[PDB]
Design a protein around this ligand. Structure first.
Ligand SMILES: Nc1ncnc2c1ncn2[C@@H]1O[C@H](COP(=O)(O)OP(=O)(O)C(F)(F)P(=O)(O)O)[C@@H](O)[C@H]1O
Ligand SMILES: Nc1ncnc2c1ncn2[C@@H]1O[C@H](COP(=O)(O)OP(=O)(O)C(F)(F)P(=O)(O)O)[C@@H](O)[C@H]1O
Ligand SMILES: [Mg+2]
Ligand SMILES: [Mg+2]
Lengths: 494, 494
């Protein structure tokens, strides 16, 4: 009858579809890439439809290449890229402006206004965030103020607003459901998180009409059905990381993971209670073992695998993210070069929308390889950067870090990472922790599963990475790292 | 009968040989490239024989290929790379160590000492220089000390020192002559230049035996005979830059040219007076209209052509320096990017030995072309940098700049250059202004010519580049450009 579950994964750079059984075997994976738009430097947008569309095929493609049918699948779980904002016409169902991606820095001006109205605490306090173009509020506004009647219709509930999940579903369900889960909500900067609700302040301050907002639900709950046909349901939602966190089973106080993808997101579960960053981190909403509200401590790094695609597609120093390793090991060292991936400003712990990407310490003998190497390395520095914040904030000492994502395939990387950390790295056996995540939720929200210690056996550690560099070595580098960073901040002119 | 003359060109990267007639038509060019030696990072040497060997090839190689004989050529003008130092066993006639190119930065330590001892002013005052591993003073020393007997023999006038010319000649004349000209001398940082003579201070300070020094002569003068056979004269000696300056016929007060080669050198004649740089420039000895001491304002820029070869040889973004334009033109603008060619530290006006090269304002959508482009652009920024100081010091307004060098072939460049300068650029009909210069001088010396107004014809302007950018536009750029530099300065840790 119904043997499977499908995870949906709307990623910064590609749409994905995953399929799995009760044993949680990942049966099949469809996956179509979409176009990144830089309307202008420090700006990033997506095509909502292209999003949409490319999300719609993976669906099929998967189904279709498994000979699976609408019927053997119970539910549909849903993860997405987290901060990215959409606003569309509702009668009509059409974007009134391209998605603004999280990484996009165009809301900086704004952001500044907020800053000198003493709003930092309220935000920091109610939202758990920080003032930055990262989060949606600003985004939304920006739009508002760029479309003409916008607020009007906004107001005649003529206009609709949502994040990716919210948008997908609206799409799946033709127009039936206008909701979102907490995690995601948590990310807008217009939602009190000791309140689990929209926040008037924000709402007004940002001058956003309550009418374009969606309902806010629990991460694993039945939100409705899709005519896949043959009606399928949707009982899962999360923003990628939190989704990822879950899949990693970092479902109890002090469990942290690091993920490696377009960017970097180090998260650590705070359990029931919300810890407050003192060190540039974020306090957000997570998942309890039951799909119930939990809290986390989050470090968000904007550039990571990304710096690598860059290499590949723009610079074209390589042809394969894959290849980076080889080249990098072609050299002994970075030869003093340092790369700062601030293509979209800085971000945590720094939070500097003006920093821009940079390369340093160039010497006439430096070559493509050094460059390449340097780029990988930047991933690692960055991670440490945040890692300490986490400690600082958490008041914990991780003795191991469990990672995951695309790049962990990179041993050199991995290795180097542990080296600079002075801590061991753990590479799980399975690899789609995020979809693992979104499914569980969805299946958990459906009887398809009725507990985690079930799925608990997939937390196998394939690889263990041990540091092999001494305490000076390390710091020595970190130091030059830090040096380089300073130099990249405040590039942009406000 | 003796229809021609010969220019010898010992360049940083190859030895050349040029031939011409009374109309100064350049008749033939031989040219073997020689090997660069980077003993280690920051270090550069050449094989003094290689240098030698090549040069001769070039010589001969020529005549042969024109069926010209020792008999139809009047003289031999001579030009070379400027700070590069030699020291050889005089009986033996052999180098006691590889040459050390102006380029090389190994005389770093030393420089500092002197720095300590408070000589800036004496130097700046009596040599027209500044402290730096650039000029040979230090160089020599450096050697001295690494070689055992050295100073002894030095002292016993047993050991010989010279610059490329100096050396070259010794070679030509077998051992007969040991002279140098002014311009070149004026480079060593051991020669008073309102004294037209060595400097005891220096000499002692640098701890060098006066013995090993050569006779310092006028640039356009008879120095000896080479048996090429059939005894040919050598009435020409200027440093490739003054050489070029000459060939560009900037032989009177306030005339300047900017050369575009492995580096950049902008020289402005002060006629009969050595004026003091208040702004990071050099006071150096040049050529009056007869081969007679003149003065000049110089801005030396370390990285130019080089940045482009770097591009081609190490980054591999290109295959041809040639190509650089087609690529550059591919994009519309630098995309906010800035490249700082401080592969060797800075240099004029800056003079920062700690500067390291770097790239700036990276954005996810930036690509190799943008990078490339920027690289050329830097070459212009750089030129204005100095242009300004010149004005400053010079107390003059160039309405037109007369360039020359390889790159002047790059239209994009030339044009950009004019646009950023907000000044007109003039590209000459002929292209080896350098050889030119030396061939005059020599022939002049030998009364092969009687006036320059007989070659004032070869000063045909092939192209005039007019600025076509608004003032803002301009300043806008330059600004970012300096932002960059500041950031690049002082990278290296001392
Ligand atoms: N061998 C490798 N070495 C280095 N980086 C690699 C390697 N293989 C993949 N990567 C990088 O990891 C990321 C790809 O895998 P991943 O599954 O994590 O995509 P995702 O993380 O799902 C995403 F962020 F890209 P998106 O939001 O687009 O889905 C890319 O940035 C890619 O460069
Ligand atoms: N078309 C071009 N556009 C840009 N850069 C160019 C172009 N052609 C050559 N280059 C650069 O020009 C330089 C060569 O200039 P040029 O040949 O006139 O001086 P050269 O005498 O050869 C010397 F520079 F080697 P040098 O005298 O410093 O030893 C190189 O460093 C190369 O990158
Ligand atoms: Mg993803
Ligand atoms: Mg030259």
């Amino acid at each position: 009858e119904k043997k499977y579950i499908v995870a949906l994964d709307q990623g910064t750079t590609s749409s994905r579809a995953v399929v799995m059984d009760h044993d949680a075997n990942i049966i099949s994976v469809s996956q179509r890439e979409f176009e990144q738009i830089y309307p202008k430097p420090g700006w990033v947008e997506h095509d909502p439809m292209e999003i949409w569309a490319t999300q719609s095929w993976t669906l099929v493609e998967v189904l279709a290449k498994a000979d699976i049918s609408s019927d053997q699948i119970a539910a549909i779980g849903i993860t997405n890229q987290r901060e990215t904002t959409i606003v569309w016409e509702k009668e009509t169902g059409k974007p009134i402006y391209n998605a603004i991606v999280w990484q996009c820095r165009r809301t900086a001006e704004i952001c500044e206004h907020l800053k000198r109205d003493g709003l930092e605490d309220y935000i920091r306090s109610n939202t758990g965030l920080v003032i930055d173009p990262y989060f949606s509020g600003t985004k939304v506004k920006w739009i508002l103020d760029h479309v003409e009647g916008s607020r009007e219709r906004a107001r005649r509930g003529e206009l609709l607003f949502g994040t990716v999940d919210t948008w997908l579903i609206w799409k799946m369900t033709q127009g039936r459901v206008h909701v979102t889960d907490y995690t995601n909500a948590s990310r807008t900067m217009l939602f009190n998180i000791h309140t689990l609700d929209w926040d008037d302040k924000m709402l007004e301050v940002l001058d956003i009409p309550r009418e374009m907002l969606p309902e806010v639900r629990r991460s694993s709950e039945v939100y409705g059905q899709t005519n896949i046909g043959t009606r399928i349901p949707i009982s899962g939602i999360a923003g990628d990381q939190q989704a990822a966190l879950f899949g990693q089973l970092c479902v109890k106080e002090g469990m942290a993971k690091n993920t490696y993808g377009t960017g970097c997101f180090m998260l650590m579960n705070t359990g029931e209670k919300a810890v407050k960053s003192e060190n540039g981190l974020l306090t957000t909403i997570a998942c309890g073992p039951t799909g119930e509200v939990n809290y986390a401590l989050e470090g968000a790094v904007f550039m990571a695998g990304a710096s690598i695609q860059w290499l590949r597609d723009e610079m074209k120093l390589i042809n394969d993210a894959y290849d980076s390793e080889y080249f990098a090991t072609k050299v002994q060292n970075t030869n003093g070069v340092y790369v700062v991936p601030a293509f979209t400003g800085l971000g945590a712990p720094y939070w500097d929308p003006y920093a821009r990407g940079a390369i340093f310490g160039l010497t006439r003998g430096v070559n493509a390889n050094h460059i390449i190497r340097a780029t990988l390395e930047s991933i690692a520095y960055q991670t440490r950067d945040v890692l300490e914040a986490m400690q600082a904030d958490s008041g914990i000492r991780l003795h191991a870090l469990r990672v995951d994502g695309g790049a962990v395939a990179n041993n050199f990387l991995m290795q180097f990472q542990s080296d600079i950390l002075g801590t061991r790295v753990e590479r799980p056996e399975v690899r789609e922790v995020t979809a693992l995540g979104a499914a569980y939720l969805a299946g958990l929200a459906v009887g398809f599963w009725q507990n985690l210690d079930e799925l608990q056996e997939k937390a196998v550690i394939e690889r263990e990475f041990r540091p092999g560099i001494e305490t000076t070595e390390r710091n020595y580098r970190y130091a030059g790292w830090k040096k380089a960073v300073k130099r990249a901040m405040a590039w942009e002119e406000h």
